[PDB]
Design an enzyme around this catalytic site. Structure first.
Site, PDB file in Angstrom:
ATOM      1  N   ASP A   1      17.251  34.291  15.171  1.00  0.00           N
ATOM      2  CA  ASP A   1      16.807  34.922  16.408  1.00  0.00           C
ATOM      3  C   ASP A   1      15.774  34.073  17.143  1.00  0.00           C
ATOM      4  O   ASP A   1      14.602  34.041  16.765  1.00  0.00           O
ATOM      5  CB  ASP A   1      16.230  36.307  16.118  1.00  0.00           C
ATOM      6  CG  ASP A   1      15.853  37.051  17.381  1.00  0.00           C
ATOM      7  OD1 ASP A   1      16.113  36.517  18.480  1.00  0.00           O
ATOM      8  OD2 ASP A   1      15.297  38.166  17.282  1.00  0.00           O
ATOM      9  N   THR A   2      16.217  33.391  18.194  1.00  0.00           N
ATOM     10  CA  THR A   2      15.373  32.448  18.917  1.00  0.00           C
ATOM     11  C   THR A   2      14.420  33.169  19.867  1.00  0.00           C
ATOM     12  O   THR A   2      13.422  32.603  20.314  1.00  0.00           O
ATOM     13  CB  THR A   2      16.215  31.429  19.701  1.00  0.00           C
ATOM     14  OG1 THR A   2      17.054  32.115  20.640  1.00  0.00           O
ATOM     15  CG2 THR A   2      17.079  30.617  18.746  1.00  0.00           C
ATOM     16  N   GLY A   3      14.735  34.425  20.168  1.00  0.00           N
ATOM     17  CA  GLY A   3      13.860  35.263  20.978  1.00  0.00           C
ATOM     18  C   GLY A   3      12.688  35.839  20.204  1.00  0.00           C
ATOM     19  O   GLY A   3      11.830  36.508  20.781  1.00  0.00           O
TER      20      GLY A   3
HETATM   21  C1  LIG Z   1      22.398  47.160  22.191  1.00  0.00           C
HETATM   22  C2  LIG Z   1      22.581  45.785  21.542  1.00  0.00           C
HETATM   23  C3  LIG Z   1      21.632  45.648  20.349  1.00  0.00           C
HETATM   24  N1  LIG Z   1      20.310  45.216  20.825  1.00  0.00           N
HETATM   25  C4  LIG Z   1      20.015  43.929  21.060  1.00  0.00           C
HETATM   26  O1  LIG Z   1      20.808  43.002  20.897  1.00  0.00           O
HETATM   27  C5  LIG Z   1      18.587  43.678  21.549  1.00  0.00           C
HETATM   28  N2  LIG Z   1      18.010  42.528  20.833  1.00  0.00           N
HETATM   29  C6  LIG Z   1      16.805  42.583  20.250  1.00  0.00           C
HETATM   30  O2  LIG Z   1      16.082  43.579  20.264  1.00  0.00           O
HETATM   31  C7  LIG Z   1      16.366  41.298  19.541  1.00  0.00           C
HETATM   32  O3  LIG Z   1      17.188  40.212  19.975  1.00  0.00           O
HETATM   33  C8  LIG Z   1      14.917  40.976  19.904  1.00  0.00           C
HETATM   34  C9  LIG Z   1      14.878  40.352  21.301  1.00  0.00           C
HETATM   35  C10 LIG Z   1      13.776  39.291  21.345  1.00  0.00           C
HETATM   36  N3  LIG Z   1      12.468  39.903  21.636  1.00  0.00           N
HETATM   37  C11 LIG Z   1      12.085  39.574  23.020  1.00  0.00           C
HETATM   38  C12 LIG Z   1      10.825  40.076  23.338  1.00  0.00           C
HETATM   39  C13 LIG Z   1       9.730  39.221  23.417  1.00  0.00           C
HETATM   40  C14 LIG Z   1       8.472  39.723  23.733  1.00  0.00           C
HETATM   41  C15 LIG Z   1       8.303  41.083  23.972  1.00  0.00           C
HETATM   42  C16 LIG Z   1       7.045  41.588  24.290  1.00  0.00           C
HETATM   43  C17 LIG Z   1       6.606  42.779  23.718  1.00  0.00           C
HETATM   44  C18 LIG Z   1       5.351  43.286  24.032  1.00  0.00           C
HETATM   45  C19 LIG Z   1       4.521  42.600  24.927  1.00  0.00           C
HETATM   46  C20 LIG Z   1       4.964  41.403  25.503  1.00  0.00           C
HETATM   47  C21 LIG Z   1       6.222  40.906  25.179  1.00  0.00           C
HETATM   48  C22 LIG Z   1       9.401  41.934  23.892  1.00  0.00           C
HETATM   49  C23 LIG Z   1      10.660  41.434  23.576  1.00  0.00           C
HETATM   50  N4  LIG Z   1      11.677  39.499  20.907  1.00  0.00           N
HETATM   51  C24 LIG Z   1      11.284  40.293  19.897  1.00  0.00           C
HETATM   52  O4  LIG Z   1      11.726  41.430  19.710  1.00  0.00           O
HETATM   53  C25 LIG Z   1      10.216  39.686  18.966  1.00  0.00           C
HETATM   54  N5  LIG Z   1       8.905  39.725  19.635  1.00  0.00           N
HETATM   55  C26 LIG Z   1       8.132  38.645  19.827  1.00  0.00           C
HETATM   56  O5  LIG Z   1       8.507  37.539  19.434  1.00  0.00           O
HETATM   57  O6  LIG Z   1       6.934  38.785  20.458  1.00  0.00           O
HETATM   58  C27 LIG Z   1       6.707  37.691  21.361  1.00  0.00           C
HETATM   59  C28 LIG Z   1      10.097  40.512  17.662  1.00  0.00           C
HETATM   60  C29 LIG Z   1      11.425  40.524  16.891  1.00  0.00           C
HETATM   61  C30 LIG Z   1       9.012  39.890  16.770  1.00  0.00           C
HETATM   62  C31 LIG Z   1       9.694  41.956  17.993  1.00  0.00           C
HETATM   63  C32 LIG Z   1      16.489  41.470  18.021  1.00  0.00           C
HETATM   64  C33 LIG Z   1      17.387  42.490  17.718  1.00  0.00           C
HETATM   65  C34 LIG Z   1      18.754  42.231  17.696  1.00  0.00           C
HETATM   66  C35 LIG Z   1      19.659  43.245  17.395  1.00  0.00           C
HETATM   67  C36 LIG Z   1      19.198  44.526  17.113  1.00  0.00           C
HETATM   68  C37 LIG Z   1      20.095  45.549  16.810  1.00  0.00           C
HETATM   69  C38 LIG Z   1      21.287  45.002  16.018  1.00  0.00           C
HETATM   70  C39 LIG Z   1      21.977  46.150  15.278  1.00  0.00           C
HETATM   71  C40 LIG Z   1      17.832  44.783  17.135  1.00  0.00           C
HETATM   72  C41 LIG Z   1      16.926  43.771  17.436  1.00  0.00           C
HETATM   73  C42 LIG Z   1      18.560  43.451  23.063  1.00  0.00           C
HETATM   74  C43 LIG Z   1      17.396  42.530  23.434  1.00  0.00           C
HETATM   75  C44 LIG Z   1      19.883  42.845  23.542  1.00  0.00           C
END
Ligand SMILES: C=CCNC(=O)[C@@H](NC(=O)[C@@](O)(CCCN(Cc1ccc(-c2ccccc2)cc1)NC(=O)[C@@H](NC(=O)OC)C(C)(C)C)Cc1ccc(CC=C)cc1)C(C)C
Ligand SMILES: [Cl-]
Ligand SMILES: [Cl-]
Ligand SMILES: [Cl-]
Lengths: 99, 99
Positions: free
Chosen positions: B25-27
């Site tokens: 997960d690059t995000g």
């Molecule tokens: C309906 C289809 C299933 N859902 C998804 O595919 C969703 N994808 C995601 O939530 C992620 O890919 C995470 C997205 C990347 N975010 C993107 C993101 C980046 C920052 C922020 C953020 C939060 C608070 C304040 C400022 C920024 C929010 C989201 N980053 C983070 O979540 C990271 N956060 C992070 O690195 O902090 C910088 C984490 C994992 C440590 C929480 C990881 C993920 C993949 C897939 C699922 C579900 C799979 C059954 C759950 C989580 C959606 C974005 C498409």
């Protein structure tokens, strides 16, 4: 390009006449953008991740340009805390993970 | 290897002697795993995803194999929808994005 992961992989996209920064997110199934106006039809959707779910509008068949690469796909619009390019579009520009 | 993105980039990891599936997960800045046991003391951390914030337990300097590639670094344990390998460990195994 080859994109390092020492930092967040942020790119510029052109979408809907607008320039925007977005994160290249191999963990996202879908592309999610902060609130913005898009043409054509949409349907509501719920998408989930760490911390729970948000409601978005799903627009299909939206032209997007990422790093000079034109693609077309579904874009979700809503109160995402950050703009993410998901696999649905990453495939279309020929993006892979390599180690 | 080279991993395309037409499906979820799930791989097998090994941590504390056990195999699990995790998402490359690059995000994600950080690696977060579903509830499990790890040795030593932990520190508190808040991490934000699409849905808001969860509290997780931070373990440091934890050996983890990702796709047979050996890394040692920080692992967060908390109520995540899926095991995710974030950039902290992706860099350790020499992962890049390419298109
Ligand atoms: C309906 C289809 C299933 N859902 C998804 O595919 C969703 N994808 C995601 O939530 C992620 O890919 C995470 C997205 C990347 N975010 C993107 C993101 C980046 C920052 C922020 C953020 C939060 C608070 C304040 C400022 C920024 C929010 C989201 N980053 C983070 O979540 C990271 N956060 C992070 O690195 O902090 C910088 C984490 C994992 C440590 C929480 C990881 C993920 C993949 C897939 C699922 C579900 C799979 C059954 C759950 C989580 C959606 C974005 C498409
Ligand atoms: Cl699509
Ligand atoms: Cl391909
Ligand atoms: Cl680390």
């Amino acid at each position: 390009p080859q994109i390092t992961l020492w930092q967040r992989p942020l790119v510029t996209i052109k979408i809907g006449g607008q320039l925007k920064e977005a994160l290249l997110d191999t963990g996202a199934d879908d592309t999610v953008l902060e609130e913005m106006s898009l043409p054509g039809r949409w349907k509501p959707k719920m998408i989930g991740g760490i911390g729970g779910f948000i409601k978005v509008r799903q627009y299909d068949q939206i032209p997007i340009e990422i790093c000079g690469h034109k693609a077309i796909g579904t874009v979700l619009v809503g109160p995402t805390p950050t703009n993410v390019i998901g696999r649905n579009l990453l495939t279309q520009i020929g993006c892979t993970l390599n180690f």
